[PDB]
Amino acid sequence: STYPPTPPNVTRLSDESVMLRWMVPRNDGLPIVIFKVQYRMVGKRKNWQTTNDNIPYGKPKWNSELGKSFTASVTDLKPQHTYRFRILAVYSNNDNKESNTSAKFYLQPGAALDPMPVPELLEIEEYSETAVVLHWSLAHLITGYYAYYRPSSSAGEYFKATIEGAHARSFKIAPLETATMYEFKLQSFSAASASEFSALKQGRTQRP
């Protein structure tokens, strides 16, 4: 059978974008091949738009005892408009199942909002041939942090991962390609907004 992903939670990243977080509960049914982020603004024909980013399931299978969490952002949204989001999961057998919809979310314009804490990205613990660990500190308006990473050699889009809880001060990012260099930056977030990014740090996975 197929277990649908949970509805995404939404937090404002800017005047034109939000970050979604969802989970795939542990289960023994078909594996999901990719995810599709959809959305539609409230007060408009109930027609969902699909973003142009097929999110792979990746590895590992689960990242907590609960199941596996995911994180993707949606940009190009207009301010002062309310939206609803949902996740589409495509399974190995090609079926499609949509999570339940998110609560209504109002994309509020920036001005007049409390400055979120900017973490000081200290150092990349080149912990292994396939993983690395982030360490940072501050100078709980915070809900957690959003880590951004990608091979230093590749402009474009960053992979995202959510770190839940304000006092997490490290996070292991794995799996990553061996003897490969990545770029990492970090930001703190709350429902209302995300902080400014920390410094963009370079880090390489260990060799044999």
- In eight-state DSSP terms, residue 130 is S
Q: Residues preceding discontinuities in the chain at C–N > 2.5 Å?
A: 139
Residue 26 is labelled as binding a ligand: no
Residue 78 is labelled as binding a ligand: no
Check whether the bond before 175 is cis (ω within 30° of 0).
Answer: yes
CA atoms within 13 A on the CB side of 9: 15
CA nearest 189: which of 20, 6, 35? 20
**Domain pair 8-112 / 113-208, same fold:** yes
**CATH 2.60.40.10 holds for 8-112:** yes
- 98-102: which pairs have CB atoms within 8 A and are 24 or more residues apart? 98/4, 98/38, 99/4, 99/5, 99/6, 99/7, 99/8, 99/22, 100/4, 100/6, 100/7, 101/7, 102/7, 102/8, 102/9, 102/10, 102/20
Residue 44 is labelled as binding a ligand: yes
Which CATH number among 2.60.40.10, 2.60.40.420, 3.40.50.1220, 3.40.980.10 corresponds to the domain 113-208? 2.60.40.10
| Total number of residues shown for the chain | 208
Q: How far apart are CA 140 and CA 115, in angstroms?
A: 12
Q: How far apart are CA 175 and CA 186, in angstroms?
A: 18
Domain residues of the chain, as ranges? 8-112, 113-208
CA atoms within 13 A on the CB side of 59: 6
Residue 40 is labelled as binding a ligand: yes
Q: How far apart are CA 189 and CA 163, in angstroms?
A: 10
